[PDB]
Amino acid sequence: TLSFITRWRDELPATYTTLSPTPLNNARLIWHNAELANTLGIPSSLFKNGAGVWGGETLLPGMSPLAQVYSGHQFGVWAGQLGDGRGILLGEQRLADGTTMDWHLKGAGLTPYSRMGDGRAVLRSTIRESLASEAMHYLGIPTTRALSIVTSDSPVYRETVEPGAMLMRVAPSHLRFGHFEHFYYRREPEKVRQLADFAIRHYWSHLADEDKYRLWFTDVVARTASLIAQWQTVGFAHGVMNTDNMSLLGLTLDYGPFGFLDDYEPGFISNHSDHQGRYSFDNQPAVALWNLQRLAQTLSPFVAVDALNEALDSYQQVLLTHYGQRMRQKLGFMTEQKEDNALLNELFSLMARERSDYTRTFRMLSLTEQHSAASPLRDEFIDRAAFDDWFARYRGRLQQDEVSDSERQQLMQSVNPALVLRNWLAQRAIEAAEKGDMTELHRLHEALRNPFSDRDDDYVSRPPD
Ligand SMILES: [Mg+2]
């Protein structure tokens, strides 16, 4: 029932190494994405009889596993050759609708690109990635998806000793900006052009059959700008916005030291190793443009310097358009005024002063009735005078929309999540998981499928501090 093709292997030779996964000791499934497997046509047969393909212990017919090579700038510095060091592309699944999905197995063992590591993933990494990628998907933000998590008795040495794990990642492509950078700086511009032709052929098929490259790169800019805009509106900090972590398709790619904002803190740094705050939450719009600028440099051998700078200059416009329009929904501004950003900056500066909870503030603000000063937010601000002064002037704008309380409260409640993957919720699932209890991991996953539905439990509370 499952059909795999070898498109990367046969159409981009010398961009990978063929190899097989190396299993772990007594690997067992601890979670799988039943909804996603149904989307992909995977029989529940495959999730029973042992770890199977999800443990790197079997290959399905058509799979030809390989580890891709790439490079990239890490923290603004050319890090040289990187590549698939902790994962293996098992193959590319062809779906009945004609589309293709990568099956990338994190922690499948050593590769030529494993660098100083061991090629292994640990249980906490796999669970945090599965929780965050799924949370992002149900928030509507493009992302890789998690299909399965396998744990084992193989110990891996990091800060502690951790159980080796493996996660099956699904995405339409794992093309990164660093794929292009890798062959540019090796002075192989024809392999840069082959990557572009490959990417347009299979993922921008409507173009490329006369200015195909300008149109394509312009859309890559738009899709990255649109992605960063969505990160900002929900309060997601990636943590490692290196050029090898930037998806060419515009997906949230690689989940490591990420963090959804608990306290509103514009300069929040989620990566403990990000000493200079390069990937701080407020720096993400600027860092993405810099990453797009690295990518355009690799395309210069075959796309005019004129068109590249034009597509690069559209980044600010596409970002602010997407950001402004979504922030307007989060604020309930059913119409548009030149004004609306000043109210938002007011609210943002008060929140940063009080360290208010980002998600809860916007969720409570969605209970707003334009003609009443009453609000559950009055108890959440120490400076109640400041909030009351912002609220009636803010409600002053709402009354200019000429729209029902019922109509505005419905729109806001469909864009302001009641629920985000907070760090402590993941840690609680992790701790239970490490002791053999997966009921918390399954429960949190279930909640993150309905993030716009209000709850009575601690999944919507502020962290315990
Ligand atoms: Mg990475």
Q: Do residues 107 and 167 lie in contact, with contact meaning Cβ atoms separated by under 8 Å?
A: yes
242 is in an annotated binding site: no
Q: What is the DSSP string of 172-183?
A: S---BHHHHHHH
Contacts of 389 (CB under 8 A, 6+ apart): none
CB atoms within 10 A of CB 343: 17
Instruction: Provide CB contacts within 8 A for 216, sequence distance 6+.
Output: 196, 199, 200, 204, 207, 208
Residues with a beta carbon under 5 angstroms from ion ligand 1: 254
Kindly provide the resolution of this structure in angstroms, with one decimal: 2.6
Q: How far is ligand 1, taken at its centre, from the CA of residue 246, in Å?
A: 9
Element (H, E) at 132: helix 123-138
85 annotated as belonging to a binding site for a ligand: yes
Phi then psi for residue 93, to 5 deg, are -80, 130
Contact 72, 243 (CB under 8 A): yes
Task: Please answer whether residues 315 and 289 qualify as being in contact, where contact means their C-beta atoms are separated by less than 8 angstroms.
Answer: yes
How far is ligand 1, taken at its centre, from the CA of residue 353, in Å? 34
Cα–ligand 1 centroid distance for 342 (angstroms):
37
* Residue 247: DSSP 8-state: B
- Ligand 1 centroid to residue 339 C-alpha, Å: 40
CA of 254 to the centre of ligand 1 (A): 5
Measured between alpha carbons, how far is 286 from 311 in angstroms, rounded to an integer? 16
**Residues 397 and 334: beta-carbon distance below 8 Å:** no
Q: How was this structure determined?
A: X-ray
CA distance 149 to 55: 9
- ∠ CA 430-433-436, nearest 5°, is 160
Residue 83 assigned as binding residue: yes
**Centre of ligand 1 from the C-alpha of residue 27, in Å:** 24
Q: Which residues contact 365 (CB under 8 A, 6 or more apart)?
A: 331, 332, 375, 377, 412, 416
256 labeled binding residue: no
Which sequence positions are flagged as catalytic? Answer: 244
Q: Where are the alpha helices (DSSP H) in 273-414?
A: 284-299, 305-331, 340-354, 358-364, 384-398, 405-413
Neighbouring C-alpha atoms within 13 Å toward the C-beta of 463 = 20
